Design a protein around this ligand. Structure first.
Ligand SMILES: Nc1nc2c(ncn2[C@@H]2O[C@H](COP(=O)(O)OP(=O)(O)O)[C@@H](O)[C@H]2O)c(=O)[nH]1
Ligand SMILES: Nc1nc2c(ncn2[C@@H]2O[C@H](COP(=O)(O)OP(=O)(O)O)[C@@H](O)[C@H]2O)c(=O)[nH]1
Ligand SMILES: Nc1nc2c(ncn2[C@@H]2O[C@H](COP(=O)(O)OP(=O)(O)O)[C@@H](O)[C@H]2O)c(=O)[nH]1
Ligand SMILES: Clc1cccc([C@@H]2NNNN2Cc2cccnc2)c1Cl
Ligand SMILES: Clc1cccc([C@@H]2NNNN2Cc2cccnc2)c1Cl
Ligand SMILES: Clc1cccc([C@@H]2NNNN2Cc2cccnc2)c1Cl
Ligand SMILES: *[C@@H]1O[C@H](CO)[C@@H](O)[C@H](O)[C@H]1NC(C)=O
Ligand SMILES: *[C@@H]1O[C@H](CO)[C@@H](O)[C@H](O)[C@H]1NC(C)=O
Ligand SMILES: *[C@@H]1O[C@H](CO)[C@@H](O)[C@H](O)[C@H]1NC(C)=O
Ligand SMILES: *[C@@H]1O[C@H](CO)[C@@H](O)[C@H](O)[C@H]1NC(C)=O
Ligand SMILES: *[C@@H]1O[C@H](CO)[C@@H](O)[C@H](O)[C@H]1NC(C)=O
Ligand SMILES: *[C@@H]1O[C@H](CO)[C@@H](O)[C@H](O)[C@H]1NC(C)=O
Ligand SMILES: *[C@@H]1O[C@H](CO)[C@@H](O)[C@H](O)[C@H]1NC(C)=O
Ligand SMILES: *[C@@H]1O[C@H](CO)[C@@H](O)[C@H](O)[C@H]1NC(C)=O
Ligand SMILES: *[C@@H]1O[C@H](CO)[C@@H](O)[C@H](O)[C@H]1NC(C)=O
Ligand code: NA
Ligand SMILES: [Zn+2]
Ligand SMILES: [Zn+2]
Ligand SMILES: [Zn+2]
Ligand SMILES: [Zn+2]
Ligand SMILES: [Zn+2]
Ligand SMILES: [Zn+2]
Lengths: 555, 555, 555
C-alpha cells in the first residue's frame, strides 16, 4: 500500500515535429499570456482594493453688498450672513432671499400664489391645513387687496408664501466667492491616510482644470461655468452643485500615486416641475419679542447647496488576489491544446478527403492529421456479452455484431464494418451443407438451439473455395508442431500427452485463427470462428467423450 | 533547436465506445455548464459593479396647530417652526417640545428629576458640575417648592431639565406631514447618473408599497405604519427613522433597469435604557436681551430624525470580469474525466471481483473496467540498481527482487510477485549440485563472493526437471543458427568469426532467454538468468581466457 | 452518430513506482491544498461581503463655567450653549470663542490683523470686497486707535475679524465632557442589523482601549490622549477629530461575530498653513433689534468637530463565491504534474549524461528519467512529401532527409541522423558503377531526370561489400516463399499466378527491406531503398512491359 502511495502518473504524449502546429501553439500561448498580463496590470487585479473614508472641511471666503427697499436698506453679507455653521460634506451659500419681517400668529389673507385668488366663501374649507399657504383656513373669504381676494388663514402674518424669488438674485456677487476644501481620506485596511493639501502648495492658487488641477480653492462661478452652468440664473431660485473628489490611489511603493481629481456636476434637475420645489431654498425663522408679542422674521433663503462627493479606492499589492487571478487564468493556457487537438480530430475524418480536399486543394496537405489521429488515439469498444467479431475471406474488412442473436444465424446479421489492423510487418517479416454456408465444409452446430445461431457462421459471404483449403490455414491452425511450439513457449515443461494437451491444442488453434484473421487481440478475444474452420480444428484435435463448450464471453 | 521550438505535444487517448460512460460524461458536462451559466447570469458575474454616490434633497410639507398654556396660547407651526435648515441625507421633524422661557444665568434649585430630591446639605457637593442638572452645585440645599427640596446650582434658571415630555405629543399632526425626497445617484466609473423623479410622475401621488412604489412623496404616518410603528407614541419622546433607497441598477443597454426601491426601518432602539437617552431630542437655545439682561429660551425639541439611507450598485458588462469568471469555472469541466477515471481505477481492482461482485450481481458487468484500465495505464517501476526479476518454471508468474542481496542467495529472497505479460500471439502465431539448486544442472558462481548471491539462482523453486532439458530451450537459446540470424538482422554484414562473435552470441542467448521467460523488455532488461541456463549458454559460447562479467545494471 | 455521442476519451498514462516522484507529488499537492485552504479561511473567500449602512446618534453631556470680562461676566455653558442641533455622523463641541456684540452695518476701521496697518490712503482700494476683513473698503485711511491706522470698510462694526483666539481656551473643561455614540448598522443584502449598545452594558462605563473597549461613552480628553493629542492646545484654535467605528462582522451562525472596534484619528492637519485656516472654527451671527436698529452679535466659535467614521463589511457564506474560488484554485493542483514532467523532460536529455553527471555524481542516479521519457513520449515527424529516410549498412543509425532533392543525388544529401528503433526482440526471438555508388551493384535510375536523384542511393556510404550479398537479404527480401507466405497471411486465397502477383511480391519485398532496415513503419513508410537492392528485387520480380513508378508519397 505504501508502494501505492509512492506512485506518480504521467500522461503518454505524442510529440509532433510540425512547424504549423508549433507556430499555432506558441502564438496562442503568447496571445493568452499577453491578454492575461494586460488584464492583470490594467485592472490592478494583483491589488486588494479598499474604499476610502473621507472627512471634508470647507471654508467659504467672500463678501456681498445688497441695496434694496419703504426706505432704502444697504446691507453687507459676510460668511455668517449667507453660510450655515455646517462645514462638512455639504455647505450652503445664500444667493437670494425673501424677507417677511414682524410676523405674528394670527389671521390674515393668504398670499395670492399659483392662482389662489378667492371669489366666494365656497372656494376654501375651514380648518383645512394648507401646507402651501402654511396656515389653517378659517373658511371665510377676505380681501387681500383692493382688486383680488383670498381666504383667511391662521398663520404667521403677513403671510407671503408663494411670492417669487427676487430677479436678479440679490447675492449675485456670490459667484465671486471662493471655497477652500480640505479633504482627509483614509484607507484603514491598508493603514494609509493622506489629504488633498500638501506642503508647498501656493495659497494664492485658484482651481483650474489644466493650470491648477490640484488647487483646492474653488471660485463658485468657475465651478458653474466649468460644466456650462449659469451661476447668475441658478442664483435666483437656487440649486444643488456636487463637487466630486475622486481618489484613484495606488499605494504600492514602486507605483505610489494617491492624488485627488476634482470634477463638478449639477445635482438638482434643471427642469424640475414647478410643483416639485424647483431649485434649492429653505425657510428660516428668526424669533424675537416686540411690543410684548412673540414675533417672527421668516427668511426664504435661496442658494446653492454644494455637496462634496468624495469617493475612490486604494489598491495595494495582495499575494492572495494575485494567486487567485493567476489560478483563474491558468486554464486559458490549454487553448492551444484544445484548438490543435480539435484540428487533428476534425481533419482526420474521411469526410474531408472525399469532399473538402478535391474542392479545396489548399487544405489537401492537411491530410497528415489522419496519421496524427492514429498515433494519438486508440479506439476501443465496450467488451459486452453481445460483442462479436466476424471476418469473411471474401470481404476485406471485419464485421462487428453487437446485437443479440435472437435465433437468426450469425451469418445473416449485418453488423457494422470495422477496419482490419495491420499485422505488424516487423513481426511478419520472418519466413448436405447448411443453407447459410457458402463453402461446402461447414456443419450444423452441436450447441443447444437457443444459442445455435452463434456457430452458424461460414468463412465467406458468397459461394467459393473454403479458407480451410489454403495451405496457410494448415500451417497456422492445423499444424500440430506449431501449436506445440507455442504451448512450450508459454509452458516449457508442458507434457505433450493426454486428453488435456489436445484441448490445449484446440484452444491454441482457435486463438491462432482469430489472431491471423483479426490481428488485434481486442477483436480476436471476441472473434467468432467459422463453422468449417472450427470443425476442422476439432477434427484435428477432437474431444473424446464430451460436448464442446464453444465461444465463451471473456468478460 | 528551432525544430524543438516547432514541437507540439498531444496526449495519447483511449476512446471508449461505452454508452454509460458517454452518458455520464455528457450529463456531468451539462450539469457543470448549467450551474456555471446560472451563477453567471444570477449574480451578474460578467458585470463590473460600482457603488453609487448619492445626493438627497428633502422638502417637508405640513402645518400643525397647538393649543396649550397661565394663559391660553394658540400657536401655528410651519416648516420653519419644526424643521432645521438641513435638507440632505437627514431631516428632523419636531413632534413635541418642552419650553423654558426667560432663563438667566444665576442660582436656582435643580428640577426634581429621577428622584433628585434633597433632604440635607450632605446630599450634594459644591462645585460639582452636574451634566444631568446642567449646572454647577453650590453645595447648599434649598427648597424647590413647599413639599420637596433640591440643591442650588448655578445654571440657566428656572432650571427644568428632567421634566417629562408632554403626553400626548403636541405636534401629533406631524403624522399627516409629507416629505418629498429627491435622490440623485451617480456611478462615476460607469459614467451614469439618474434621479428618483422622472418626467411624467404624477404630483398628487403619495407613496404606497404596491399602488405607488415609485412615488417619492411619503406621509410620515404611512412610513411608521408600513413597518408597524406607532407615530403617536414615538412622537412623545421622538426617535430615528431610516428611509432606505436601494438602487439595484443594471446599466447594460439590453437589460437597462435603474430604479429605486423604498423601504423603512426604525433606527433607534425602542427599548433603550432610561439612562441612555431614549428616543430623539435636542436642546436648542434662543438667546435674547430683556430688562438689560441676557436671557435664554430653552426648547427641548423631541421629534423624529429621518435618515435617508441611499445605497446600491451599478453593474455594467466588463469583458475582463467575464474572462476571469470563465477561467475560474473552466477547471470544473474536468469533473466528468475525474469521475469516470476514478470509476475505471477503482472497478479494475481485483478486490471487487472477489467480494463485491459475488455479493452484488448488479455491479458485475462493471468488470469491463479492468480492460479499460489495462488499455489506459502502463505500470513501470523505477530501474534502480537493486531491481531484479526472476522466473521459476514451477511458478506461473515472475518475481521482483528490489532489495539488496546481503549475502543471501537470490533464490532464497522472496520479493513481490508480478504478472507475466502475454507474448504477442500475433508475433508468436508463426511456426555436487548447490544446495539452493533444485534441477541438478546449476553450478557455483565464479563471481567474487561479495556479489556471488546474484548468480545463486535456479530455474525452479522445487525439485524437478531442468528447463534446459526442454528442446525449446535449445531452439531459442542454444541454437547457434537462430542467434546468428538475429545478429545478422541487426548487423547484416557482421563477420561470423573470431572470439567476438562468440561473446555476441552469448549476449544474444541471454537476451533471448530473458525475453522468452519475461516477455517484456522492461523485465528482461533486469531479469536474472538461472545458473544452469547461464552456464549451459556459456558452455555453448564460452570465453577463451577471461572471467565473465555477469549481469550489468543497465542504468 | 449516436455511437459518437456515446464516446468517452481517457488519457493514456504511465504509472511510475518511484518513491521520489510520489513524495514530490504528494508534498506539492499538500502544499497547494494547505495554501488554498489558508487563503480561503483567512480571507473568508467563501463569504459574500457587503458594506454596511450606518446611522449615528450622538449625545454630549457636560457643563462648563467661564469667567471673563469692562465688567466681570460669569457664564454657564450647557449643551445648548456649545453644541449644534445636529447629532449625526458629526457633532461639534465649542472650546473657545470670540464675541463681538452689538454690530451694526456701517463704516469702521478694519481690525489690524496680519500686519494690516495703514499709513496712507494708497494702501487700500475703494470698493474692494475684502473677504479677510469681511467688509468693502471705502478707499480712505482712518485711525483704528491712537498709534495705528487702518482703512475704512463698510461692514458689521466694530469689526474684529483677525483677532486671536483666547489663550487659554475658555471652554477647556470640555476635555471632561462625555459623548454617548449610538451606532445602528445594517447589511441589507444579508438582511442583518445590529447596534453598538446591547442589553446588559453598564451605564456608568467610560470607554477604554483595554478595560472597556465596548463602552460607547467617550471622554473627549481621553479620545485626544489615546492618540497623543493635547486637548488643551487644540481647544484654542480647534480641530477635527475622527471617531472610527470599524465593523468586521461575520454573519455565519457557526462563527457569528459582529462587534464594533473604536479608534481615534486626528483629521485636521496640525501644521496647516496660517493662511489656510488652521484648526476649526465658524462664525455664527445672532441677530436682534436694539435702539430701532438691526444689530448682530458675531461669535467666532472655535472647537473640535468630532466626525464619527463608521465603516466595515458583513461576510456571509455564499456557495457561488466558494465555487468560484475553488475553480480558480483547481488549476494549481497540476503543479506536481508540471514539475515532475519537467524533471523527466530535462533529465532525459543526453546533455546531462555527458557533462552534469560526471561532474556531479549525486545527480547520476537520475538517469532513469530517460527510461521514463521513452515510456511517456513517442516522437513523430510531419509526413511531408519531402520526408525521406535512408539507412547505410556502414553507419549504425538512419538518416532523415527532409529537404527537396534539387538535382543533387540523395546519397550526397546529409540530412539529420535519427536513432534506430529496437526491432522487437520478442518477435525476433524466433528462428560501370555510378560514381555515387560504393558497392558495385547499383545501377542508374530509370526515372525521369527531374526526379532521378531520389533513386541515386547506395547501400553504404563508403566502399565495401554490398548488403545484397548477405544471405539474410535473400532470406528476407528475395525469398519468394517468404513473400508468398506474407501475401497469403494477408490474403489467404490470393492466386499465386499472373503478372499481378509479381508486382505484389515486388512491393512486399520493398516493405520487407524497409521494415528490416528501419524497423518502425513510420520510417519504413518513407524509407528509400538503395538502387542495388531495388534493382535486385526488380530482377527477381520484374515488370513485363512497364516502367517502375518508384517511391510514392504515402500522404
Ligand atoms: N474467439 C473465439 N473463441 C472460441 C470460439 N469457440 C471456442 N472458443 C474458446 O474455446 C473454449 C471452448 O473450447 P471448445 O473446443 O469450443 O469446447 P471445449 O472442448 O469444452 O473446451 C472457450 O473458452 C472459448 O473461449 C470462437 O469461435 N471464437
Ligand atoms: N538480463 C541479464 N543480463 C545478463 C545476465 N548475465 C549477464 N548479462 C549481460 O551479459 C553481459 C556480460 O556477459 P557475460 O557472458 O556474463 O560476461 P562477459 O564474457 O565478460 O561478457 C552484461 O552486459 C550483462 O548485461 C543475466 O543474468 N540477466
Ligand atoms: N518505402 C519505399 N517504397 C517504395 C520504394 N520504391 C517503390 N516503393 C513503393 O512501390 C510502389 C511502386 O512499385 P515499383 O516496383 O517501384 O513500380 P511499379 O512496377 O509501377 O509498381 C510505390 O507505391 C511505392 O510506394 C522505396 O524506395 N521505398
Ligand atoms: Cl440662509 C442663512 C444663512 C446664514 C445666515 C442667515 C441669517 N439668519 N437670520 N438672518 N440671516 C441673515 C440674513 C439677512 C438678510 C437676508 N437674508 C439673510 C441665513 Cl437666513
Ligand atoms: Cl427643534 C426646532 C426646529 C425648527 C425651529 C425651531 C424654533 N427655534 N426656536 N423656536 N423654535 C420654534 C418653536 C416654537 C415653539 C415650540 N417649539 C419650537 C426649533 Cl426649536
Ligand atoms: Cl458655536 C455655538 C454652539 C451652540 C450654541 C451657540 C450659541 N449661539 N449663540 N450664542 N451661542 C452661545 C454662546 C454664548 C457665549 C459664547 N459663545 C457661544 C454657539 Cl455660538
Ligand atoms: C466679480 O468680480 C469682478 C471683478 O472683481 C466683477 O467685474 C464682477 O462684476 C463680479 N461679479 C458680480 C456678480 O458682482
Ligand atoms: C499604521 O501606520 C502608522 C504610521 O506609519 C504606524 O505607526 C502603525 O504602526 C501602522 N499600523 C497600525 C496603525 O496598525
Ligand atoms: C445667465 O442668467 C442671467 C439671468 O440672471 C442672464 O441675464 C444671462 O444672460 C445668462 N447668461 C448666459 C450666458 O446665458
Ligand atoms: C390627519 O388627518 C386626518 C384627516 O385630515 C385627521 O382625521 C387626523 O386626525 C389627522 N391626524 C392628526 C394626528 O391630527
Ligand atoms: C459621460 O457621459 C456624458 C453624457 O452622455 C458624455 O458627454 C461624456 O463624454 C461621458 N464621458 C465622460 C464624462 O468621461
Ligand atoms: C399609539 O400610541 C398612542 C399614545 O400616544 C395610543 O393612544 C394609541 O393607542 C397607540 N396606537 C396603537 C395602535 O397601539
Ligand atoms: C476635569 O475634571 C478633573 C476632576 O474633576 C479636574 O481636576 C480637571 O481640572 C478638569 N479639567 C478641566 C480642564 O477643568
Ligand atoms: C429579514 O429578517 C427579518 C427578521 O428576522 C425577517 O422578518 C424578514 O423576513 C427577513 N427578510 C426580509 C426582510 O426580506
Ligand atoms: C497642552 O497645551 C497646553 C496649552 O494650552 C500646555 O500648557 C500644556 O503643557 C500642554 N500639555 C502637554 C502634555 O504638552
Ligand atoms: Na482552472
Ligand atoms: Zn461454409
Ligand atoms: Zn469454409
Ligand atoms: Zn538448478
Ligand atoms: Zn535448471
Ligand atoms: Zn551501390
Ligand atoms: Zn549495394
Amino acid at each position: 500500500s505504501w508502494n501505492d502511495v509512492f506512485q506518480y502518473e504521467t500522461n503518454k504524449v505524442t510529440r509532433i515535429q510540425s512547424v504549423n502546429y508549433g507556430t499555432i501553439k506558441w502564438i496562442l500561448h503568447m496571445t493568452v499570456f499577453s491578454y492575461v498580463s494586460f488584464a492583470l496590470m490594467s485592472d490592478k487585479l494583483y491589488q486588494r482594493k479598499e474604499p476610502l473614508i473621507s472627512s471634508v472641511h470647507t471654508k467659504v471666503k467672500g463678501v456681498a453688498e445688497v441695496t434694496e427697499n419703504t426706505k432704502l436698506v444697504h446691507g453687507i453679507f459676510d460668511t455668517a450672513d449667507y453660510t450655515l455653521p455646517l462645514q462638512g460634506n455639504s455647505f450652503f451659500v445664500m444667493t437670494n432671499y425673501l424677507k417677511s419681517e414682524g410676523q405674528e400668529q394670527k389671521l390674515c389673507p393668504e398670499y395670492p400664489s399659483r392662482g389662489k385668488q378667492c371669489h366666494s366663501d365656497q372656494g376654501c374649507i375651514k380648518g383645512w391645513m394648507d401646507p402651501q399657504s402654511k396656515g389653517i383656513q378659517t373658511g371665510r373669504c377676505i380681501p387681500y387687496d383692493q382688486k383680488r381676494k383670498t381666504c383667511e388663514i391662521f398663520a404667521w402674518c403677513p403671510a407671503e408664501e408663494g411670492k417669487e424669488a427676487p430677479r436678479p438674485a440679490l447675492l449675485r456677487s456670490a459667484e465671486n466667492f471662493t471655497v477652500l476644501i480640505k479633504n482627509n481620506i483614509d484607507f484603514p485596511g491598508h493603514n494609509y491616510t493622506t489629504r488633498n493639501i500638501l506642503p508647498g502648495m501656493n495659497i494664492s492658487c485658484t482651481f483650474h482644470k489644466t493650470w491648477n488641477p490640484q488647487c483646492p480653492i474653488f471660485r463658485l462661478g468657475d465651478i458653474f461655468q466649468e460644466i456650462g452652468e449659469n451661476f447668475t440664473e441658478v442664483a435666483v431660485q437656487g440649486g444643488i452643485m456636487g463637487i466630486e473628489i475622486y481618489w484613484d490611489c495606488n499605494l504600492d511603493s514602486w507605483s505610489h500615486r494617491c492624488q485627488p481629481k476634482y470634477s463638478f456636476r449639477r445635482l438638482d434637475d434643471k427642469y424640475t416641475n414647478e410643483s416639485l420645489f424647483p431649485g434649492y431654498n429653505f425657510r428660516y425663522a428668526k424669533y424675537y419679542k416686540e411690543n410684548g408679542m412673540e414675533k417672527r422674521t421668516l427668511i426664504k433663503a435661496f442658494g446653492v447647496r454644494f455637496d462634496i462627493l468624495v469617493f475612490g479606492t486604494g489598491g495595494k499589492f495582495d499575494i492572495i488576489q494575485l494567486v487567485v487571478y493567476i489560478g483563474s487564468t491558468l486554464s486559458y493556457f490549454g487553448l492551444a491544446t484544445v484548438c490543435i487537438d480539435l484540428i487533428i480530430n476534425t481533419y482526420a475524418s474521411t469526410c474531408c478527403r472525399s469532399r473538402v480536399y478535391p474542392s479545396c486543394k489548399c487544405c489537401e496537405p492537411c491530410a497528415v492529421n489522419e496519421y496524427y489521429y492514429r498515433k494519438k488515439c486508440e479506439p476501443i469498444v465496450e467488451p459486452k456479452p453481445t460483442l462479436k467479431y466476424v471476418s469473411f475471406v471474401d470481404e476485406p474488412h471485419i464485421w462487428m455484431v453487437d446485437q443479440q442473436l435472437l435465433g437468426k444465424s450469425l451469418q445473416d446479421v449485418k453488423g457494422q464494418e470495422v477496419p482490419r489492423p495491420q499485422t505488424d510487418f516487423l513481426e511478419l517479416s520472418r519466413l448436405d451443407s447448411p443453407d447459410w454456408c457458402q463453402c461446402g465444409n461447414c456443419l450444423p452446430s452441436q450447441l443447444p438451439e437457443n444459442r445455435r445461431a452463434l456457430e452458424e457462421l461460414c468463412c465467406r459471404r458468397k459461394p467459393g473455395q473454403c479458407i480451410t483449403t489454403s495451405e496457410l490455414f494448415s500451417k497456422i491452425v492445423l499444424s500440430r508442431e506449431a501449436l506445440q511450439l507455442l504451448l512450450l513457449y508459454q509452458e516449457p515443461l508442458l507434457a505433450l500427452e493426454g486428453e488435456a494437451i489436445n484441448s490445449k491444442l484446440r484452444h491454441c488453434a482457435y486463438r491462432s485463427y482469430a489472431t491471423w484473421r483479426f490481428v488485434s487481440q481486442d477483436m480476436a478475444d471476441f472473434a467468432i470462428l467459422p463453422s468449417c474452420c472450427r470443425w476442422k480444428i476439432r477434427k484435428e484435435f477432437p474431444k473424446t467423450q464430451g460436448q464442446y463448450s464453444g465461444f465463451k464471453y471473456p468478460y
